[PDB]
Design a protein around this ligand. Structure first.
Ligand SMILES: *C/C=C(\C)CC/C=C(\C)CCC=C(C)C
Lengths: 262, 88, 1033, 262, 234
């Protein structure tokens, strides 16, 4: 008759998530600014920060037997899809840039890690900031795959199917490409030298494996919406992963970001 | 896992030398309708994946894939396709 | 027509208030059957309509804002009856629990009640209270009024009883009933039958009440009623099987009209609806109304009112004098409005007006029935429809027909367009040709003619060793542990969870009875106690019977189940068919077939059923998932965690039965140690349970579980000898057998279970699992216990064929499985030749099935016509229309038919039966039942056919004396004998073998020999000149 | 978003009522027994014992903005309706008694104070118990009026309207009729001597003032469902209480049952 | 005509994918007015009707179980267009508020947007953006698609924005606009007139939007939009 006590604690977590994570959710784009001082939204900070909403929504959907529980679960899952579609729009507004990165593995053709939270636009130029973080798009693709597997319909059309596939193409070469990494500073010296970071390539391996042979349309999908991953690239990522671990890169004896890949 | 290998000969005369050595192999014509191609053809046909001309996406760049790619069995336009490893 | 809409409704306001609402019982809300006379009798069925009549006017009264309080007076007039109807049933809640467990005429809900107290009036002996429609019409109407906004269910305790009322209605597919006219059949012997009108109402009731909140707009997840989809489907299957016939005795009944229309609209097949309809219209329509059924003796001039039963021969006296009921015209008038054709409203209005009567105030009266006077019954019999009939009710007499009065108010409002059809039928029951997206109502997204359902199939492996092994051959099986949100449950486990549905100790109802859940139920996805549940179908259970361990059988058990789901599953979401692969399936040569179906299952089509193969997590993400809240509303969140499926981490018998059974010494126990065969100890421990008690101990322990462990051992290692003795000496039953016998019997296919040459029991009407158990084992067979095990095999196999190949069992009135075993074994003697033939107790079940298909195929192949005649004769396969033709043979024969010491007379056979009648078919079989030699029987039927193809084409020749087919059979044989003696002079005498291998049709065919025999005997009589056909010579 | 603290304390109150009063409600007829020892149902104890159920129903209906709150409010309100309609069945099963008591105000023509809680029947005869209690029928009628004004739909037919009017005439002469009273014993002597106790007359006046010009289908009603009460009998009742109070009867200087009247 | 109904629906699938869905903007989901020319012109009403056509095809395809993902593809293409319109409007939400407080042809939401960025392209002076047929048709198609099961509105902030769009729409009886033809009237003076088409579309939107749970079946009291009865009456 009454809500379960688990529900009580879960509305407690609801107030907590609302007052911490979801209260800064930009309305127009669904993105999340880093702070009040830093009014821009990073890809990786957004993807990692929306995880709370995913967890709370899945927790409610476990006990979604009443209308308001359905409503809360729906609110959280659709906030997840809001953020991830906002990020998809930010990436797809820059399709030529991914296209250039596909054939030219350069740091000048890498998607900006930070975007304008209020218009899905670019805040700074391609050279004003360290933007090549192949572990931001990596975690974005990994959690896109995981939310599609968990009942969240994020991508909406075949154009997005080909964009996500060409973004796998964007990330498939993460093993043989240096990136400024999870900490947006490149090497140890922090002097503009991009380096092969273990966390980035491990996130890439996860995105490649998890999204392999996956219907981005969900269960109600077809052969046009299954995105194909070659095992060769993901296993090269795995190989240089063991060969480089327990280090984080050539200049890096250890990073706590390896916690993201182990 | 165990790896299956289909030892193949181009012509009947190369098949005969192996047969003289007690080896049972098939030709590119005996394997038909299963069609055998090199890995470069694989890299080319995989470049049509994700292509969207309006979105100006043209698929994957020409990349060599290792023995992992050639050891999978492909169906292209209802035809069985096997691609040979690139180290040959 | 300038009257305000106030005026026309006031016209109808009077009628209900003066003719129905005046007589509504103020205490129980019921409507008495007899308006005058002081009778307390109130029936369940008619009282439902009277409330609906006020309901129909109430919805018309919803169109006025100035209703002067009339709408609530008429809306709650329906509620008062339904709650009073609801109140009456609880009063009998002890009977509801009994009927749930053991459906019987002596445990059912009553149908008549005291109008002024609601107390039971007539006992089971006095009145036949088994009337499914009354309970079904209540449930169908109850949701119907609740959807419109009326509030009848008040507390959760009523929810449990109505939920339990569903459990009673769920079993009407197999429980016979007396039907609407509380008579049971035309013979009125008190014998219960299955009726389409009663069965159809429950299907409509279950369709509407499924998932319906009894609390209306003011309701939550604890007030929904859950209906077993499998139970509805088995009821759905029976309804189409019985139709267009109402019952076995009834070729057509006008009581089918409420079944195919208001209230039910239970038939989702238009064609059937049309064929059902005309047989009602053609055979029962009359000037004064619709007769109840042909040869109906209710309130007839030739009926003694004192006797409560009719004499078997009294039925013919009711032909042509059946009472015509004007109410059934009102039923048709609603049909005209609902299905959009306007004429049907007018033509059946023009018939209702002359038969309508009126009160002193001018309020029209609908008579119950019009009876032909006894002074005119002879004239009415000679020329039906030419004599005036007197109304049972006329008005000004104090007698009114409330059920007819109720339909009059409903029909006129729809005719006057004061109620639209959508208002009076809120839970759509009539859906126009736009038949799509109705839950449980045969209209899926595809509609009424497309059935290309894609079924969601998830592959689950028993053990981790299996899934790698299956993966090495290209099959991707997830495993139980891999899916934590998803907990996989046995089908018997969903039962325990379901024993908590409808539980109320206050009224003492136990909930859903412990029953297996069928394919449709296991096809849904469930949430018990917050854990996601997927149940693998019962066809993977290894306990019910020993046919499931055979991969080839499991190969088809998946196949027909997939076909069963594809064609019957008409829900919103896609069904989930989990597959479970056990180790015994892979070990041995059994890997080869299971892989192929798994591989074809990967492709996307199996058995003609489109499938969708993916992971269980993917395949469950967004489908409409079934909610199991009643396990939580009782605060049983700490209910024991239900036991999910757990990942697992050669000679012929050297001992003959007669060799050691005849052996007197008890040394045979030492022989048990001496012998080494698995089939052996299946017997020595089997006789041990009988010779020295049930639970004696031995080397391993108590003997009771040794037979079980042998059966567990025997089934896995597939020496099917032991798995048959082990399954026989332990007296086990398959739950699927219980409604298998029901399915055969609702098709008109009589079931008898007894060995060839031994005692056989006739199952004319279906029985319960408890009863059939004693018939299978105790009373029928005692020569060999293993006879039941093979016996129990086919009745599942027959159930498989009757569904996949219905035509294959055509022509046989009865399926005598015991004779099929004799047929089964005899053909092996032909198959084996001059060699010890294979033992039927040694073949695997698929071989028994494939043997069954081979010899019951149509054109038996490569059989010397002797073997075709043996197979067909032992199989009792009769030509299509054979029973029809012998009736015609019986029609124009004065001295009837004699067959080997039985006598089929023209009278009282012709007067008491009909040419299409089902009862006549039994008698002719009874006439032919004495033919011991099977090929003689098939010769008899061809002779019986031969005269039929003779007589109908040759209408002048009639028999004079008795027709003894044996004399007809022999004389054909002797004149046969002389010709072949002229050919080669065969020295065999009195040997029919030369006749049986002779083909029926040919140069000198058996038919040509037979017709000569029938030509002469017909020719020894008078050639009657026809008035129709003049003679030229 | 979450249920208010009023809702949670009300859920506690609902569990209290369930455990205490409502779990003995006989499902068949909606009545309540006296105890486990005495199985039968008094109409007074039945009408009063669902007052908590009524209050729960109205309290839930005030905050019934969700499916489960709406459904539990419905369950409580219609459990109340169930009990008062079951008691209506009990009273109408003795319509001859009402008709007789209307004219001849005898104790042998009175509606029974107790009814079979399983079959809406009279367990005991007209003389085995003191049945004439004109405050129990009075409390029934008063609460029927109060429920009809608050929107509860208890009676369903015009025959119920006529039976309520004949009950009005049954309670009309309560000011001039002696009854065993609230304690089923008449006077202080407890000897079957019926007396004019003030509680019966006062409850009669309360019901009569309640059932005046009260449309008894409620707002969806008309002239046929107005219950008509003559104020002459009402004022006679008031005069008799004024003469009686603070005494409850001639034989008792004061009875605490006058708390049911003051 | 023995053609299976899959071939019949595949005909219209072709037509949609080749002529209509080929031009949907990947970034905003809008359908440009000019298919060729490089013009970034995206009309709200045009894209609304395009999404309606795709949704109608999806409704057709809903009747076949083995859809090969076409039902989802068309349903979510329509959802993508409808959500791109929503994004374009909440980019102007300040103009939503300033139209709520004071409707004016210089205070209205834009009726055209950049197809490839979603930003404003033509200013108030250049183009007449006060077209109530845009926002009213938006609300109407929104409620039609959510009723059909198209889950378009995502969180309560979109609920608030759509409700403020209803606030803007409720005022149309007194807001003269340029109409569906963005010309204003016959004379082409840039003058604002009251149009029957716009007020009718807004009336239909208010009727359907009223008491509508934007979350579909998956929603509660906090997703229902409330419409001023008087405003719709006027
Ligand atoms: C006119 C009717 C007559 C002459 C009856 C006698 C005729 C027959 C005997 C011949 C009937 C046999 C066949 C028609 C095949």
């Amino acid at each position: 008759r009454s809500r379960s006590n688990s529900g009580v604690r879960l509305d407690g977590y609801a107030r907590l998530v609302q007052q911490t994570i979801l209260c800064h959710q930009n309305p127009v784009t669904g993105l999340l600014p880093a702070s009040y001082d830093q009014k821009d939204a990073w890809v990786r900070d957004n993807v990692y920060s929306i995880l709370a909403v995913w967890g709370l929504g899945l927790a409610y959907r476990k006990n979604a037997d009443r209308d308001e529980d359905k409503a809360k679960a729906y609110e959280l899952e659709q906030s997840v899809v809001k953020l991830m579609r906002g990020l998809l729009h930010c990436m797809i507004r820059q399709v030529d840039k991914v296209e250039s990165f596909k054939y030219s593995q350069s740091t000048k053709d890498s998607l900006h890690a930070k975007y304008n939270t209020k218009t899905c636009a670019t805040v700074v130029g391609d050279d004003q900031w360290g933007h090549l973080q192949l572990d931001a798009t990596s975690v974005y693709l990994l959690f896109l795959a995981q939310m599609t597997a968990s009942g969240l319909h994020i991508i909406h059309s075949l154009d997005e199917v080909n964009f996500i596939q060409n973004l796998v193409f964007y990330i498939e070469a993460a093993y043989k490409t240096a990136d400024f990494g999870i900490w947006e500073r490149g090497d140890k010296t922090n002097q503009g030298i991009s380096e092969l970071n273990a966390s980035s390539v491990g996130m890439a391996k996860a995105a490649l494996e998890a999204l392999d042979e996956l219907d981005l349309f969900g269960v109600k999908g077809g052969p046009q919406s299954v995105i194909h991953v070659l095992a060769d690239e993901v296993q090269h990522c795995q190989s240089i992963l063991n060969s480089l671990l327990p280090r984080a890169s050539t200049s890096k004896e250890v990073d706590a970001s390896l916690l993201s890949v182990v | 896992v165990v790896v299956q290998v289909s030892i193949l000969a181009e012509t009947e005369e190369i098949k005969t030398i192996l047969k003289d050595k007690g080896i049972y192999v098939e030709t590119i014509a005996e394997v038909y309708p299963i069609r055998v191609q090199p890995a470069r053809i694989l890299s080319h046909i995989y470049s049509s994946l994700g292509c969207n001309n309006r979105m100006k996406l043209s698929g994957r760049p020409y990349r060599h894939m290792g023995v992992l790619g050639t050891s999978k069995l492909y169906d292209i336009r209802k035809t069985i396709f096997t691609f040979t490893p690139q180290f040959i | 027509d300038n009257e305000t809409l106030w005026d026309k409704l006031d016209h109808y306001y009077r009628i209900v208030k003066s003719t129905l609402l005046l007589y509504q019982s103020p205490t129980t809300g019921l409507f008495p059957t007899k308006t005058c006379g002081g009778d307390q009798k109130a029936k369940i069925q008619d009282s439902l309509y009277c409330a609906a009549g006020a309901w129909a006017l109430a919805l018309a009264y919803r169109r006025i804002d100035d209703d002067k309080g009339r709408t609530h007076e008429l809306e709650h007039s329906a509620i008062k009856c339904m709650r009073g109807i609801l109140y009456c049933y609880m009063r009998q809640a002890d009977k509801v629990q009994q009927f749930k467990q053991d459906p019987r005429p002596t445990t059912c809900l009553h149908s008549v009640f005291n109008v002024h107290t609601g107390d039971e009036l007539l006992s089971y002996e006095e009145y036949g209270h088994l009337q499914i429609n009354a309970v079904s019409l209540y449930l169908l109407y109850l949701v119907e009024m609740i959807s419109s906004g009326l509030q009848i269910i008040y507390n959760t305790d009523e929810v449990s009883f109505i939920q339990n009322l569903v459990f009673c209605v769920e079993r009407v597919y197999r429980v016979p009933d007396f039907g609407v006219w509380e008579r049971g059949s035309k013979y009125n012997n008190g014998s219960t039958e299955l009726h389409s009108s009663s069965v159809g109402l429950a299907k409509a009731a279950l369709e509407a009440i499924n998932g319906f909140n009894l609390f209306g707009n003011q309701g939550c997840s604890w007030s929904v009623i859950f209906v077993d989809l499998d139970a509805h489907n088995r009821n759905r299957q029976t309804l189409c099987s019985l139709l267009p016939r109402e019952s076995r005795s009834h070729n057509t009944d006008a009581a089918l009209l409420p079944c195919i229309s208001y209230p039910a609209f239970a038939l989702d097949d238009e064609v059937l609806f049309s064929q059902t309809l005309d047989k009602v219209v053609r055979k029962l329509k009359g000037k004064y109304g619709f007769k109840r059924f042909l040869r109906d003796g209710y309130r007839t001039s030739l009926e003694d009112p004192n006797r409560c039963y009719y004499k078997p021969a009294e039925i013919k006296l009711f032909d042509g004098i059946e009472c015509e009921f004007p109410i059934f015209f009102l039923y048709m008038m609603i049909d005209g409005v609902f299905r959009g054709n306007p004429k049907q409203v007018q033509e059946y209005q023009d018939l209702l007006t002359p038969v309508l009567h009126h009160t002193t105030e001018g309020y029209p009266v609908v008579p119950k029935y019009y009876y032909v006077p006894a002074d005119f019954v002879e004239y009415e019999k000679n020329n039906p429809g030419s004599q005036k009939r007197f109304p049972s009710n006329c008005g000004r007499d104090g007698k009114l027909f409330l059920w007819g009065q109720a339909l009059y108010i409903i029909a006129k409002l729809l005719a006057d367009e004061l109620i639209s059809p959508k208002d009076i039928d809120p839970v759509q029951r009539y859906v126009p040709l736009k038949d799509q997206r109705n839950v449980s109502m045969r209209f899926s997204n595809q509609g009424p003619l497309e059935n290309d359902l894609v079924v969601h199939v998830a592959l689950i492996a028993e053990s981790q060793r299996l899934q790698v092994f299956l993966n090495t051959y290209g099959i991707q099986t997830q495993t139980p542990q891999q899916v934590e949100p998803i907990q996989i449950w046995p089908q018997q486990e969903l039962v325990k969870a379901y024993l908590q549905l409808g539980i109320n100790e206050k009224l003492g109802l136990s909930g859903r009875p412990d029953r297996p859940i069928g394919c449709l139920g296991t096809s849904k996805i469930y949430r018990i106690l917050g854990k996601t549940v997927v149940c693998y179908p019962i066809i993977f259970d290894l306990s019910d019977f020993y046919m499931s361990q055979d991969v080839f059988l499991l190969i088809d058990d998946i196949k027909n189940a997939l076909q069963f789901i594809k064609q019957y599953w008409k829900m919103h979401g896609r069904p989930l068919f989990l597959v479970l692969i056990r180790e015994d399936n892979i070990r041995g040569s059994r890997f080869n077939p299971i892989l192929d179906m798994l591989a074809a299952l990967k492709k996307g089509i199996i058995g003609g059923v489109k499938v969708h193969v993916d992971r269980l997590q993917t395949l469950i993400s967004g489908a409409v998932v079934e909610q199991l809240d009643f396990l939580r509303i009782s605060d049983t969140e700490e209910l024991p965690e239900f036991k999910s499926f757990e990942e697992l981490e050669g000679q012929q018998p050297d001992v003959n039965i007669s060799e050691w059974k005849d052996k007197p010494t008890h040394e045979i126990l030492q022989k048990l140690n001496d012998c080494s065969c698995l089939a052996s100890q299946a017997i020595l421990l089997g006789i041990l349970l009988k010779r020295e008690g049930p639970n004696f101990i031995t080397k391993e322990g108590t003997v009771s579980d040794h037979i079980e462990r042998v059966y567990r051992r025997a089934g896995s290692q597939k020496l099917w000898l032991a798995v048959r003795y082990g399954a026989a000496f332990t007296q086990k039953f398959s739950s699927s057998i219980a409604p298998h016998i029901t399915t055969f019997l609702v098709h008109g296919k009589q079931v008898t279970l007894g060995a060839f040459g031994h005692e056989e029991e006739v199952i004319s009407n279906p029985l319960s699992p408890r009863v059939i158990q004693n018939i299978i084992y105790y009373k029928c067979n005692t020569h060999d216990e293993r006879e039941a095990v093979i016996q129990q095999e086919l009745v599942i196999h027959i159930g498989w064929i009757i569904s996949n190949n219905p035509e294959l069992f055509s022509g046989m009135l009865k399926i005598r499985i015991g004779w099929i075993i004799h047929a089964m074994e005899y053909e092996l003697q032909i198959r084996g030749g001059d060699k010890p033939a294979l033992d039927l107790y040694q073949l695997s079940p698929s071989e028994v099935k494939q043997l069954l298909l081979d010899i019951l195929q149509p054109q038996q192949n490569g059989r010397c016509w002797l073997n075709r005649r043996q197979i067909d004769g032992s199989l009792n396969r009769t030509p299509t229309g054979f029973y029809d033709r012998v009736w015609q043979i019986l029609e124009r024969t004065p001295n009837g038919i004699i067959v080997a010491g039985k006598h089929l007379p023209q009278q009282p056979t012709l007067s008491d039966m009909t040419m299409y009648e089902m009862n006549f078919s039994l008698l002719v079989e009874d006439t032919l039942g004495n033919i011991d030699q099977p090929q003689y029987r098939q010769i008899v039927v061809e002779l019986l056919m031969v005269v039929s193809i003779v007589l109908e084409r040759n209408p002048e020749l009639e028999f004079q004396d008795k027709v003894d087919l044996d004399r007809l059979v022999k004389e054909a044989f002797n004149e046969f004998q002389k010709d072949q003696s002229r050919l080669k002079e065969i020295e065999k005498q009195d040997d029919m073998t030369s006749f049986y291998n002779t083909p029926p049709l040919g140069k000198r065919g058996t038919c040509s020999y037979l017709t000569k025999a029938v030509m002469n005997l017909l020719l020894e009589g008078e050639v009657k000149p026809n008035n129709d056909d003049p003679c030229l010579i």
